[PDB]
């Protein structure tokens, strides 16, 4: 079953090594790939090998790598090992690339995922020399069918001077038809178009990405799997978090502040948000609808149990066993999933209009409910902000989820002051840990503190937090958001110095 | 001429004092008022008097005060002096109210101005007992014509149990027609409506606020002026900032990254703004368009010259001289201005669609370009975040402007780490001080730092900043966003302890 159904384009098929030779040192390369789904694989490997060879000969050979979101070991992993990426945007989860970033060997900036397409069109990343995009198939009309994610692929195809397509036989042919690619101006030159989405399950586009065939310089036939980590089966900590939130939603419904079927759900990357979805798959809320950035195992379970009717997202983020599950049951799931451009799925105008409920994980929050999603001790990148800002600020309800402690209790997830801020107080209304739920709506900072400390803090750390806060109220420069600047960041320094936030 | 053209409502006219008696201890009160414009005046004054009298007899008397944005002396000032506000939102510029907030005598939360209506409808502030709105006139069918701002007035009218109107004859009658009020679902229950604004000069609604006449409990005839602030005449610092920004606009135009008429302009509230508006007034760019929260003296002038074709905002932000140059020629300016609900003028979907250029002031930024707009030393409130968040994140271009120092040079506006964050790195692309302009587009945090330090920081503080950065690069826990947590906030603590961020030479400092 020929995947390249356009006859004329078959003449552009060539090996990965030859194709990679189109990528020059200094090139800006835009690729498909979103949370371990749909990134190119074979051309990156071939590139990485040639990069290492060139480095030994003393030839500079690095690229700027712009993606949808995070990719996999074949892309981020291989290129980082080869020391071949001088700039990376906007999101990564590969350990080797992360090490490059945190060692200052690769420059990194995690843009709001929903803005990357627009900033690319604006020229923020420079001119795109190459778009490297993985496809399920190429239609007779020359349409490019995406794989397990859409990401920024349409925008990258538009901008790039040259186009390389990887047609991956591994990807299920029945992916064709699952995507919704819109013809309108979302992230182009102002004035942009109104995106006529008024329901999360509404399609407004077509099944294929469009590209001038004259720009396609090479097509590489591939056969290699998406690779992403499994999710942690929800333990007692995660299940407690799920329990608190579901109870919360329940009361909201009883008070008629939410409909019985809630509102369109966004669930972010990570184990905790996934654990919540596992809770929802057997919860008291029916006819649920997903308007998310990614579909993780838990959301897939919800569609399976029937609690969720349909899920909109830009990408899959499935475990190896979940991915294998959906590709055996593509018949069932295909009619319940819509994969959109990432600048549509994370469009603020749409998110607010739909009234999405945002559920996201976090590194830490301070007592006033400022949120760190990214930088441990304020300097060491974990993954990136992703679309968490897109959704948190635009949502009807912004909810953040975390164990109250980290690293076996040696770190408190509730701190005097966040070492880095991704989400300001105004962007966070609800906090949930295994200790309880803090509802911050309508509260001043001092009021937010009392709630967060009492409800969410771990018993090991709560008195220390209360000690900080009470002395801050006595001594702070101002009393609106009381701080003791001499010790605001001292818990983080203590961890650095001793390996634990707990004093001796 | 009679301002109340609806006969039936005329019998609800009563004195300010009588009207104020409707407001009871513990009430949530929603009022009109936005950047010194269109706030109620006489009822709050009477309310404050009765509050003080109660307090003098050991009787509690306080309200929750929710507004459009900042008000004026007759409202925030009077009530703060009376200590009659237990909770305040979302924005304040009154000195007395600011003292109450910073002493913890008034609880305060500065929501995004564009989100306030929605959060009120959600019930975040509780049940609204009273709506108190200033009006230019009341039409034949009972429509309420706003005055010099729209703010959240329509939402407050919908929510409140009882309504009080102040009909202010100081406000020019020809304000009627300048407002655009939508009956569509902007900030109500999901699913909300598409707000179909695709041009900055587009009207989608009507000229009046709508309210059930049965809820109007009192109408007060008033005659009192809006009270804002004198003209902030641009100093050499502000002029320098304006100069650098205009050079930047010029360059973007020549590289075809902006059209010759630029894009719809949002100008923040502040003194640096006028310098920029003055600059645009004499600049090379024609057919300018305003899509902002406020309309300042500078915008008025460009509208007058035809330099700017239209200005959309939620409110006036004028000097007293500007307040009546426009009330002499309201006839003229009413055709050049559209005043919208603030949840429309600060709507993210619309701001992004129109591709607005956002220009806002700041307290400080750290070397990595995270921005503080609100809390001095991290704990003391200035004004509030306002709509700066609405615009900065949604804009086509996000620009922040500030003197490179504060308090006669004793504070650096560029610091190792911001004491508080309102706008994260991702929400800020351009920084401008009197020292220069930093273009941060496409840069990593370390790259952002090299630009901000070399272009924007004051020469008095640059070697200190470079020293912190250099040693952070060597020693930071991670090297992606290098920090020394031992001294990240030490400059702020230095100011608290000694009144200056500059170190003494009686002790060692690495940059020496
Ligand atoms: C913040 C985030 C890392 C949390 O992940 P999670 O899987 O729910 O939470 P976990 O408790 O399993 O923690 C994951 C990792 O973060 C670390 N971590 C979490 N909180 C921490 C803290 N306070 N201090 C230090 N490390 C912390 C854990 O140790 C773990 O790292 P490790 O496996 O190397 O030991 C993740 O949600 C994220 O990257 N968010 C940003 C993107 C986003 O939210 N996008 C939303 C739209 S799709
Ligand atoms: C941040 C803000 C206060 C700056 O105002 P501005 O007029 O450009 O700037 P100025 O340099 O005149 O300073 C304003 C005040 O802040 C103080 N200030 C500014 N930077 C400071 C700093 N780094 N440290 C301490 N104080 C500082 C000034 O001393 C002055 O205070 P003062 O009245 O006690 O003397 C103002 O823009 C603001 O409140 N912004 C938030 C609202 C907003 O942006 N809304 C969206 C647009 S409608
Ligand atoms: Cl839209
Ligand atoms: Cl709130
Ligand atoms: Cl809209
Ligand atoms: Cl950028």
How is A74-100 classified by DSSP, letter by letter?
A: IIIIHHHHTT-EEEEES----HHHHHH
Q: Does A104 touch chain B (CB under 8 A)?
A: yes
Interface touch B477/A354, C-beta < 8 Å = no
What are the b/e assignments for A291-329, b being 16+ CB within 10 Å?
bbbbbbbbbbbbbbeebbbbbbbbbbbbbeebbebbbee
Helix (H, G, I), strand (E, B), or coil: what is residue B241?
helix
Residue among B223, B224, B226, B237 at smallest CA distance from B319: B226
Dist CA B503 CA B467 (whole Å): 13
Residue among A387, A394, A373, A369 at smallest CA distance from A449: A369
As for chain A, the residues directly before each break of C–N over 2.5 Å are: none
Residue among B215, B204, B74, B207 at smallest CA distance from B138: B207
Between vectors from CA A305 to CA A304 and to CA A311, what angle results, nearest 5°? 55
Residue among A469, A374, A379 at smallest CA distance from B486: A379
Which chain B residues touch A110 with a CB distance below 8 Å? Answer: 426
Dist CA A310 CA A288 (whole Å): 7
Dist CA B480 CA B483 (whole Å): 9
Task: Give the residue, by CA position, lying nearest to ligand 1 atom 6.
Answer: A270
Residues 208-227 of B with CB under 8 A from A: none
Please report, to the nearest 10 degrees, the dihedral formed by the alpha carbons of residues B68, B74, B79, B80 taken in order.
Answer: 90
Dist CA B109 CA A410 (whole Å): 33
Question: Residue B63 to residues B66, B83, B169: CA-CA distances in angstroms?
Answer: 10, 10, 27
Question: Residue A142 to residues A5, A452, B48, B178, B451: CA-CA distances in angstroms?
Answer: 8, 55, 73, 52, 44
Task: Enumerate residues 6+ apart whose C-beta is below 8 A from A100.
Answer: A80, A83, A85, A106
Are A381 and B478 within 8 A, CB to CB?
A: yes
- Classify residue A426 by burial, with Cβ atoms within 10 Å: 0-12, 13-18, 19+: buried
Residue among B75, B16, B65, B2 at smallest CA distance from B219: B16
**CA A197 distance to own-chain centroid:** 22
Which ligand ends up closest to the CA of B347? 5
Helix ranges, B143-220 (H):
153-159
Rounded to the nearest angstrom, the distance between the alpha carbon of B269 and the centre of ligand 2 is: 9
Residues 458-477 of A with CB under 8 A from B: 472-473, 476-477
Question: Residue B36 to residues A276, B113, B169, B375: CA-CA distances in angstroms?
Answer: 46, 15, 17, 21
Interface touch A379/B480, C-beta < 8 Å = yes
Which chain A residues touch B202 with a CB distance below 8 Å? Answer: none
Task: Enumerate residues 6+ apart whose C-beta is below 8 A from B313.
Answer: B290, B292, B293, B294, B295, B337, B338, B339, B340, B345
Give the helix/strand (H/E) hosting B394.
helix B388-394
Q: Does A354 touch chain B (CB under 8 A)?
A: yes
Residue among B411, B392, B403, B422 at smallest CA distance from B464: B411
Are B105 and B87 within 8 A, CB to CB?
A: no
Name the token pair of A140: 């007779």
Which chain B residues touch A422 with a CB distance below 8 Å? Answer: 424
- Classify residue A503 by burial, with Cβ atoms within 10 Å: 0-12, 13-18, 19+: exposed
Any idea which residue has 């920004």 for tokens?
B245
Experimental method: X-ray
Q: How far is A118 from chain B, CA to nearest CA, in Å?
A: 9
Give the helix/strand (H/E) hosting A49.
helix A42-57
Q: Does B409 touch chain A (CB under 8 A)?
A: no
Strand B380-381, strand B375-376: pairing: antiparallel
Rounded to the nearest angstrom, the distance between the alpha carbon of A186 and the centre of ligand 5 is: 13
Q: Does A409 touch chain B (CB under 8 A)?
A: no
Rounded to the nearest angstrom, the distance between the alpha carbon of B344 and the centre of ligand 5 is: 9
Question: Residue A310 to residues A243, A280, A294, A338: CA-CA distances in angstroms?
Answer: 23, 14, 13, 8
Name the token pair of B21: 């008696």
**Structural domain spans, chain B:** 1-512
Cβ count within 10 A of residue A196: 11
Task: Give the residue, by CA position, lying nearest to ligand 2 atom 41.
Answer: B385
- What are residue B337's DSSP bridge partners? B311
Q: DSSP character for B75?
A: I
Interface probe, candidates B480, B489, B492, chain A, greatest A C-beta count within 10 A: B480
Interface touch B352/A354, C-beta < 8 Å = no
Q: DSSP character for B73?
A: I
Any idea which residue has 């009972």 for tokens?
B142
Rounded to the nearest angstrom, the distance between the alpha carbon of A90 and the centre of ligand 6 is: 10
Across the interface, of A190, A385, A488, the residue whose CB is closest to B396 is A190
Residue among B265, B233, B269 at smallest CA distance from B249: B265
Which chain B residues touch A425 with a CB distance below 8 Å? Answer: 109
Neighbours of ion ligand 6 (CB under 5 A): A 119, 124; B 441-442
Q: Does A377 touch chain B (CB under 8 A)?
A: yes
Residue among A118, A198, A195, A207 at smallest CA distance from A159: A118
How is A192-232 classified by DSSP, letter by letter?
A: PPP----STT---SBSSB---GGGEEEEEEE------PPPP
Which ligand ends up closest to the CA of B234? 2
How is A480-497 classified by DSSP, letter by letter?
A: SS---TTTTTHHHHHHHH
Dist CA B158 CA B440 (whole Å): 44
In degrees and rounded to multiples of 5, residue A153 shows phi and psi of: -55, -40
Residues with CB under 6 A from ligand 2: B 268-272, 293-294, 360-364, 373, 376, 382-383, 386-388, 403, 406-407, 411, 413
Dist CA B154 CA A76 (whole Å): 52
Interface A-B: count of C-beta contacts within 8 A: 231
Helix (H, G, I), strand (E, B), or coil: what is residue A359?
strand
Are B370 and B421 within 8 A, CB to CB?
A: yes
Name the token pair of A406: 């980290």
Dist CA B395 CA B428 (whole Å): 10
Q: How far is A97 from chain B, CA to nearest CA, in Å?
A: 12
Dist CA B483 CA A230 (whole Å): 33
Dist CA B296 CA B334 (whole Å): 15
What are the b/e assignments for B351-379, b being 16+ CB within 10 Å?
bbbbbbbbbbbbbbbbbbbbbbbbbbbbb
**CA A207 distance to own-chain centroid:** 23
Catalytic residues of B: 293
Cβ count within 10 A of residue A446: 19
Strand A28-31, strand A337-340: pairing: unpaired
Are A213 and A9 within 8 A, CB to CB?
A: yes
Interface touch B426/A354, C-beta < 8 Å = no
Residue among B438, B365, B425, B395 at smallest CA distance from A90: B425
């Amino acid at each position: 079953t020929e995947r390249i159904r356009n006859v004329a384009l078959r003449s552009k098929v060539c090996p990965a090594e030859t194709a990679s030779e189109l990528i020059k040192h200094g090139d800006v390369v835009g690729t498909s790939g979103f949370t371990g789904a749909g990134y190119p694989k074979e051309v990156p490997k071939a590139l990485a090998q040639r990069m290492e060879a060139a480095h030994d000969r003393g030839e500079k050979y690095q690229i700027s790598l712009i993606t949808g979101a995070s990719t996999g070991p074949q892309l981020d992993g291989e290129l980082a090992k080869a020391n071949g990426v001088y700039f990376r945007s906007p999101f990564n989860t590969d350990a080797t690339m992360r090490n490059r970033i945190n060692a200052g060997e690769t420059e990194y900036f995690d843009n709001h995922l929903g803005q990357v397409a627009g900033r690319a069109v604006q020229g923020n990343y420079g001119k795109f020399n190459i778009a490297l995009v993985e496809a399920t198939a190429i239609t007779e009309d020359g349409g490019i069918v995406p794989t397990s994610s859409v990401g920024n692929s349409q925008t990258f195809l538009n901008l790039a001077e040259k186009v390389i397509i990887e047609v991956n036989e591994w990807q299920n042919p029945m992916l064709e038809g699952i995507h919704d690619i819109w013809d309108g101006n979302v992230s182009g030159v102002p004035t942009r178009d109104i995106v006529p989405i008024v329901r999360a399950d509404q399609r407004v586009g077509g099944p294929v990405l469009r590209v001038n065939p004259d720009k396609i310089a090479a097509i590489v036939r591939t056969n290699d799997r998406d690779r992403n980590a499994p999710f942690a089966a929800p333990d007692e900590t995660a299940k407690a978090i799920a329990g608190y939130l579901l109870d919360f939603f329940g009361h909201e419904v009883k008070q008629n502040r939410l409909p019985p079927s809630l509102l369109p759900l966004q669930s972010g990357v990570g184990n905790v948000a996934n654990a919540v979805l596992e809770g929802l798959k057997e919860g008291p809320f029916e006819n649920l609808v997903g308007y998310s950035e990614v579909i993780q195992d838990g959301m897939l379970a919800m569609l399976d149990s029937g609690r969720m009717r349909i899920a909109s997202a830009s990408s899959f983020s499935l475990s190896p066993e979940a991915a294998e599950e959906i590709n055996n049951r593509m018949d069932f799931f295909r009619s319940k999933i819509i994969l959109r451009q990432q600048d549509v799925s994370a469009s603020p105008g749409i998110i607010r209009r739909l009234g999405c409920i945002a559920m996201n994980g976090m590194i830490e929050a301070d007592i006033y409910g400022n949120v760190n999603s990214t930088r441990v001790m304020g300097s060491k990148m974990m993954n990136g902000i992703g679309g968490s800002g897109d959704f948190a600020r635009s949502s009807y309800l912004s909810i953040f989820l975390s164990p109250s402690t980290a690293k076996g209790g040696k770190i408190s997830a509730i701190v005097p002051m966040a070492a880095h801020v991704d989400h300001i107080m105004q962007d966070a209304q609800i906090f949930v840990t295994e200790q309880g739920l803090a509802d911050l709506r309508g509260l001043s900072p001092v009021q937010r503190a009392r709630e967060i400390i009492s409800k969410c803090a771990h018993p090991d750390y709560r008195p220390m937090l209360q000690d900080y806060f009470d002395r801050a109220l006595k001594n702070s420069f101002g009393k609106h958001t009381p701080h003791l600047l001499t010790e605001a960041l001292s818990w983080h320094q203590r961890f650095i110095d001793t390996g634990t936030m707990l004093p001796s």
